[PDB]
């Protein structure tokens, strides 16, 4: 464990907090339409594949891989 993260600081430039985890992003990242995510979180939510090239889909306010997304957008409906 690190048990660090020390350093007193006042105001700070606004950062696009990731959606998957929920933490202020810094540096390289994947900016979504109206949302923001990390360069590693951008991966699918079901399995976790790099949607960098493949791409991400919108289902129930979530992101998945065409492989999973298609299955969700097409099929049953979980209340």
Enumerate the known binding-site residues for Zn(2+). Answer: 18, 21, 38, 41, 44, 47, 65, 68
Position among 16, 17, 20, 72 found at the interface with Zn ion (CB under 5 A): 20
| 43 lies in the site for Zn ion, by CB under 5 A | no
- What sections of 1-79 are H helices per DSSP? 51-54, 66-73
Which is nearest to 61 in space by CA: 31, 19, 30? 19
Q: Is 16 exposed, middle or buried (0-12, 13-18, 19+ CB in 10 A)?
A: middle
Select the span of 2-10, 14-22, 28-36, 52-60 touching Zn ion (CB under 5 A): 14-22
Position among 46, 62, 71, 72 found at the interface with Zn ion (CB under 5 A): 46
Q: Are 5 and 24 in contact (CB under 8 A)?
A: no
Strand partners, 43: none
- Of 21 and 26, the one with the shorter C-beta distance to Zn ion is 21
Residues found near Zn ion in the complex (CB under 5 A): 18, 20-21, 38, 41, 44, 46-47, 65, 68
């Amino acid at each position: 464990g690190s048990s660090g993260s020390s350093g007193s600081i006042g105001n700070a430039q606004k950062l696009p907090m990731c959606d998957k985890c929920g933490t202020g992003i810094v540096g390289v990242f994947v900016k979504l339409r109206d949302r923001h995510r990390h360069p590693e979180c951008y991966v699918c939510t079901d399995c976790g594949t790099n949607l960098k090239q493949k791409g991400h889909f919108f289902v129930e306010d979530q992101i998945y891989c065409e492989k999973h997304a298609r299955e969700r957008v097409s099929g049953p409906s979980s209340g």
